Amino acid sequence: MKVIVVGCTHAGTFAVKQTIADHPDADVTAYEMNDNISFLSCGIALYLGKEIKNNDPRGLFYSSPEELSNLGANVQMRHQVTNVDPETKTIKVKDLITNEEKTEAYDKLIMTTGSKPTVPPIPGIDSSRVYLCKNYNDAKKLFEEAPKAKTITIIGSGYIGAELAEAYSNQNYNVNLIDGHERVLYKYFDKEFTDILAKDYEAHGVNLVLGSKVAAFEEVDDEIITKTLDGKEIKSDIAILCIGFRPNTELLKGKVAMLDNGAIITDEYMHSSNRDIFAAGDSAAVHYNPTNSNAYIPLATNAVRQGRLVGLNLTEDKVKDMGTQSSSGLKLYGRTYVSTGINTALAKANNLKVSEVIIADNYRPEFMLSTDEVLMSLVYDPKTRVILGGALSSMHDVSQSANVLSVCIQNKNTIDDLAMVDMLFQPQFDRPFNYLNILGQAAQAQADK
Amino acid sequence: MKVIVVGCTHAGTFAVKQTIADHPDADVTAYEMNDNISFLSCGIALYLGKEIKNNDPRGLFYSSPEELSNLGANVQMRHQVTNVDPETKTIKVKDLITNEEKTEAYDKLIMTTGSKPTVPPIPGIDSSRVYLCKNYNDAKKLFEEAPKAKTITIIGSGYIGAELAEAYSNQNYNVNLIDGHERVLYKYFDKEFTDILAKDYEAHGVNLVLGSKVAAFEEVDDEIITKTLDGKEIKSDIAILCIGFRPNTELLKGKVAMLDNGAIITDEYMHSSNRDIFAAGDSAAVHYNPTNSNAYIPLATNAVRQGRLVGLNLTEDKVKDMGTQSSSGLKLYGRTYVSTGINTALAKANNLKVSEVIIADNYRPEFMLSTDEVLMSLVYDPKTRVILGGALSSMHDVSQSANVLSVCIQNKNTIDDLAMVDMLFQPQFDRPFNYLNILGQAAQAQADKAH
Numbered sequence: 029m030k031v032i033v034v035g036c037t038h039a040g041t042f043a044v045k046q047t048i049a050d051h052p053d054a055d056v057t058a059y060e061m062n063d064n065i066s067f068l069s070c071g072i073a074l075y076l077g078k079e080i081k082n083n084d085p086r087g088l089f090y091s092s093p094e095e096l097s098n099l100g101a102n103v104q105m106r107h108q109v110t111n112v113d114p115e116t117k118t119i120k121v122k123d124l125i126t127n128e129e130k131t132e133a134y135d136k137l138i139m140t141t142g143s144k145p146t147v148p149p150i151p152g153i154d155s156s157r158v159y160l161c162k163n164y165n166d167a168k169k170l171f172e173e174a175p176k177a178k179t180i181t182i183i184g185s186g187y188i189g190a191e192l193a194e195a196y197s198n199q200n201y202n203v204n205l206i207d208g209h210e211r212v213l214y215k216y217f218d219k220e221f222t223d224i225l226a227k228d229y230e231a232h233g234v235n236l237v238l239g240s241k242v243a244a245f246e247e248v249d250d251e252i253i254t255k256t257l258d259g260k261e262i263k264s265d266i267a268i269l270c271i272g273f274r275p276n277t278e279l280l281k282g283k284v285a286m287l288d289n290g291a292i293i294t295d296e297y298m299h300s301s302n303r304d305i306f307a308a309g310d311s312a313a314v315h316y317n318p319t320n321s322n323a324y325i326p327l328a329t330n331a332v333r334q335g336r337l338v339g340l341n342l343t344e345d346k347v348k349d350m351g352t353q354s355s356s357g358l359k360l361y362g363r364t365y366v367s368t369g370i371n372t373a374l375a376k377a378n379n380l381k382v383s384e385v386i387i388a389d390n391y392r393p394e395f396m397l398s399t400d401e402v403l404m405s406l407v408y409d410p411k412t413r414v415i416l417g418g419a420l421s422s423m424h425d426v427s428q429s430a431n432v433l434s435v436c437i438q439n440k441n442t443i444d445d446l447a448m449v450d451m452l453f454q455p456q457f458d459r460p461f462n463y464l465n466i467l468g469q470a471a472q473a474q475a476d477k
Numbered sequence: 478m479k480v481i482v483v484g485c486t487h488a489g490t491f492a493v494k495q496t497i498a499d500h501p502d503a504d505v506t507a508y509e510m511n512d513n514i515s516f517l518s519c520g521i522a523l524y525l526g527k528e529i530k531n532n533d534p535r536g537l538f539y540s541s542p543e544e545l546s547n548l549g550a551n552v553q554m555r556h557q558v559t560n561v562d563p564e565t566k567t568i569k570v571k572d573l574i575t576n577e578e579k580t581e582a583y584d585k586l587i588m589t590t591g592s593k594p595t596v597p598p599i600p601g602i603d604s605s606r607v608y609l610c611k612n613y614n615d616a617k618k619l620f621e622e623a624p625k626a627k628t629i630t631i632i633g634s635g636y637i638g639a640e641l642a643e644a645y646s647n648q649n650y651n652v653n654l655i656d657g658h659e660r661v662l663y664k665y666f667d668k669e670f671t672d673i674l675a676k677d678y679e680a681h682g683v684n685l686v687l688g689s690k691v692a693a694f695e696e697v698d699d700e701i702i703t704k705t706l707d708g709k710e711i712k713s714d715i716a717i718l719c720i721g722f723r724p725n726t727e728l729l730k731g732k733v734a735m736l737d738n739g740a741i742i743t744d745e746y747m748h749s750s751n752r753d754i755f756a757a758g759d760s761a762a763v764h765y766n767p768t769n770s771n772a773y774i775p776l777a778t779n780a781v782r783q784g785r786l787v788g789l790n791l792t793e794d795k796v797k798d799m800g801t802q803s804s805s806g807l808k809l810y811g812r813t814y815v816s817t818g819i820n821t822a823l824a825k826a827n828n829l830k831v832s833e834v835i836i837a838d839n840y841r842p843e844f845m846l847s848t849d850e851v852l853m854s855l856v857y858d859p860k861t862r863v864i865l866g867g868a869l870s871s872m873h874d875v876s877q878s879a880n881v882l883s884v885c886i887q888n889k890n891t892i893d894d895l896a897m898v899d900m901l902f903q904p905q906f907d908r909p910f911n912y913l914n915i916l917g918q919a920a921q922a923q924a925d926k927a928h
């Protein structure tokens with residue numbers, strides 16, 4: 029059977045490998061419009077920060093055309109799919125070097141076209157001093173342009189802009205970080221967490237320009253100035269846009285069911301509204317467990333799992349999607365910040381009524397020769413007491429705790445469950461009750477009044 | 478109503494505090510045979526290893542007679558409960574300073590009498606150069622007296638013995654570690670984990686004397702010679718016995734339902750077979766989730782949980798025990814070793830049929846400036862694919878991953894759930910799939926091939 033995979037980074041690479049693994053009757057073709065596949069975008073900030081082995085971006089690839097071709101896939105780089113017609117099971121594809129366009133049939137189509145960076149329709153985006161940050165070629169451009177810059181402006185303080193700002197400030201660039209929200213990582217963490225980060229930014233010489241969106245760029249002399257709606261004008265050698273992503277799904281607009289942003293809605297086996305077209309990764313919606321609904325959560329975690337499920341379910345509905353909790357994290361200036369599920373910002377934006385407790389405790393006993401404060405939040409349903417989300421931050425790497433809370437959320441466990449569930453004690457690791465147990469107990473006490 | 482707590486370390490302290498917080502009409506008396514309460518025995522190896530603040534063991538106490546008295550408890554230290562008579566609801570109590578005995582009534586009795594050290598009738602075990610290691614007074618004695626020794630022998634390589642060998646090996650004593658098993662931590666971790674620990678012991682000068690039990694001790698001059706069955710004679714200045722514990726439960730032998738070893742069987746609200754006598758901690762059996770049955774898992778985690786449940790359930794059946802998974806861990810020479818649930822050694826002892834996979838992966842990508850291998854095992858039920866246990870070890874602190882597996886066991890999650898459940902990705906922490914996901918995927922691959 030003929031299987032065509034459109035796009036080959038995280039989701040497409042996994043879909044190809046799992047398909048070939050489980051269906052030796054599959055003749056697979058991958059179309060990718062870039063001149064590369066299988067590049068780890070999630071390593072870009074460490075690469076630009078000069079914090080990967082030998083500063084060598086070859087180590088950020090987890091596959092290659094030769095590897096996939098030896099599995100037996102027909103890998104066609106610099107090829108752009110320009111049409112999909114679900115009713116006839118055909119696509120049109122353009123060779124980008126020769127401009128030659130061909131229509132071809134498929135038995136199954138896998139839409140792993142991901143997302144593109146959001147580029148706001150404002151003056152100056154065409155400047156050679158404005159940089160995107162999504163893919164290998166973007167990364168290479170930034171890494172090569174670094175020696176010619178001493179001042180960088182980063183627009184957008186989501187996960188990517190937060191990491192870049194840290195990465196450039198640790199190399200003694202002058203850094204400006206600009207966002208329309210009044211806090212960094214506004215949608216991602218409570219104020220008690222982002223206040224800590226802001227303090228660290230200012231201690232490392234980062235100029236935080238918060239509360240007004242960028243309205244324009246203007247290239248003048250060997251610099252660009254970034255201009256906010258409220259009148260500020262910020263000069264740098266270069267500027268980097270980090271204001272999010274949108275599903276790359278124009279090919280299927282009006283043809284399969286989608287969220288308002290274009291994310292392809294799928295059943296539990298990764299089929300779109302058309303049975304022979306699968307979607308996975310940043311092209312697709314996820315089943316979000318905390319609100320039992322479809323959501324857009326463009327993370328590599330979802331790309332690899334969705335890609336895997338496409339391969340598993342290619343011919344048969346064999347393995348249901350477990351859904352996801354938006355588990356994510358970062359480490360900035362040595363401090364870990366992790367979260368899973370819902371937070372109070374996202375609850376307010378969606379008119380959900382939730383409860384939350386915020387507590388701080390040393391992760392292990394004070395009699396130890398060292399310990400560190402862990403700041404913790406737990407978000408739960410006031411009526412069912414089911415856990416809906418949580419977040420932790422410490423100088424100690426508490427990241428694996430977000431995975432504990434993710435499993436709680438997956439099983440719809442309550443604050444009462446978390447309060448008492450067995451967790452190991454040894455003073456090198458924790459107090460007799462683990463800090464997650466203590467968090468649950470604090471939520472219980474709040475709920476009981 | 479009159480509440481009597483017998484024994485006051487982990488379980489008894491939690492029981493007293495929770496009881497008083499939830500039951501203003503409880504009139505609590507606490508009897509403790511020792512001259513101290515509320516000491517953290519789980520801190521002794523760090524104290525003895527000079528790895529706590531100011532090497533001050535007062536920092537290991539989580540309560541005090543003054544604190545419990547201010548809450549309204551009548552704290553009676555150096556008092557031993559010598560009899561419990563359910564038929565009259567009375568106990569007998571000896572004052573250990575004066576030898577006087579008095580009888581009193583109870584409405585509720587809370588048996589938090591814990592465990593006592595196993596001491597077999599091995600000849601010479603009585604010697605003044607043989608030390609126990611259970612409580613504050615044992616620890617204080619070792620802290621005072623070990624510096625006089627050049628060579629320390631540790632008998633028993635379970636959790637305590639292993640910790641003590643590490644602690645003393647880092648202060649440049651000669652250390653012998655003796656055990657009847659062929660591997661350190663035999664009961665607790667697979668060989669793949671314990672081979673690593675053994676070489677670390679050896680590289681820090683610890684002499685491992687494995688495979689033969691101690692048969693006799695002999696005191697000669699100012700030394701003690703420990704003699705194994707196989708003919709080895711191990712000379713040292715002192716010996717420390719770390720060969721386990723048993724329930725301290727003679728007061729109720731023949732009076733309430735127990736396991737063969739004396740552990741008091743309770744219902745989900747911590748009642749013994751006698752409605753007005755509760756049990757919590759090392760005196761009690763746990764509800765062990767992996768086998769869905771009663772077991773003896775003497776850990777602080779169970780003591781604090783069971784003590785809390787006694788206080789919550791003192792007058793009304795309010796909160797059910799969720800049971801436990803035997804989650805435990807050590808950090809030895811900077812390496813984390815953690816476990817939850819069943820292991821293959823334990824299954825093989827109880828005739829349980831399980832499957833297990835063991836894999837090793839770097840915890841985070843190889844392009845990072847550094848990463849560390851994490852060695853991992855997962856035990857699961859071949860018929861239901863349900864997770865029954867797991868273990869991890871790494872130079873990176875992967876301890877909280879054992880708690881992820883604990884929560885999976887709690888919920889009877891399968892290897893297939895573990896393979897795909899959402900866990901975060903950032904290259905500072907892990908690969909796109911977390912090492913635990915990778916573990917579940919390995920278990921899936923094994924289970925699928927074997928049919």
Ligand SMILES: Cc1cc2nc3c(=O)[nH]c(=O)nc-3n(C[C@H](O)[C@H](O)[C@H](O)COP(=O)(O)OP(=O)(O)OC[C@H]3O[C@@H](n4cnc5c(N)ncnc54)[C@H](O)[C@@H]3O)c2cc1C
Pocket residue numbers: 034035036037038039040059060061062069070071072073107108109110140141142143144161162163188276308309310311326327328329330331901902903904
């Ligand atoms: C800088 C950065 C840091 C990130 N950090 C993290 C992190 O730490 N953890 C985490 O979990 N996630 C992180 N993310 C998100 C994560 O990288 C994405 O969710 C993931 O890359 C999505 O993978 P994908 O395969 O769905 O899509 P994409 O990576 O978007 O790849 C889609 C591919 O499809 C190709 N394509 C598109 N249209 C066509 C067409 N018409 N014809 C042919 N080919 C086409 C594109 O060229 C591209 O190669 C980060 C993202 C970025 C940009």
Ligand SMILES: Cc1cc2nc3c(=O)[nH]c(=O)nc-3n(C[C@H](O)[C@H](O)[C@H](O)COP(=O)(O)OP(=O)(O)OC[C@H]3O[C@@H](n4cnc5c(N)ncnc54)[C@H](O)[C@@H]3O)c2cc1C
Pocket residue numbers: 452453454455483484485486487488489508509510511518519520521522556557558559589590591592593610611612637725757758759760775776777778779780
């Ligand atoms: C050295 C060591 C290290 C350990 N490490 C860990 C670890 O890292 N993590 C973990 O989870 N667990 C660990 N444990 C186990 C943990 O300490 C025990 O599970 C816990 O102490 C048991 O608490 P308890 O209150 O049940 O009993 P116990 O601490 O044994 O206390 C019972 C009390 O009852 C008193 N008593 C007994 N009989 C009478 C009587 N008749 N009258 C009056 N008083 C009486 C005793 O004097 C004692 O004070 C360790 C144990 C030791 C000894």
Ligand SMILES: Nc1ncnc2c1ncn2[C@@H]1O[C@H](COP(=O)(O)OP(=O)(O)O)[C@@H](O)[C@H]1O
Pocket residue numbers: 148183184185186187188189206207208209214215240241242243270271272273
């Ligand atoms: N025009 C703009 N000027 C400044 N900030 C903007 C602008 N447009 C969007 N943003 C900000 O960019 C961020 C969007 O990034 P986000 O998608 O949430 O994270 P990430 O890009 O790392 O996935 C938000 O904090 C938002 O306020």
Ligand SMILES: Nc1ncnc2c1ncn2[C@@H]1O[C@H](COP(=O)(O)OP(=O)(O)O)[C@@H](O)[C@H]1O
Pocket residue numbers: 632633634635636637638655656657658663664689690691692719720721722
């Ligand atoms: N006579 C003996 N000689 C040497 N080792 C012994 C002897 N008796 C018991 N042991 C060992 O003592 C160890 C006790 O450890 P265990 O009870 O399982 O953990 P813990 O440190 O909590 O006490 C066991 O490995 C057992 O082999």
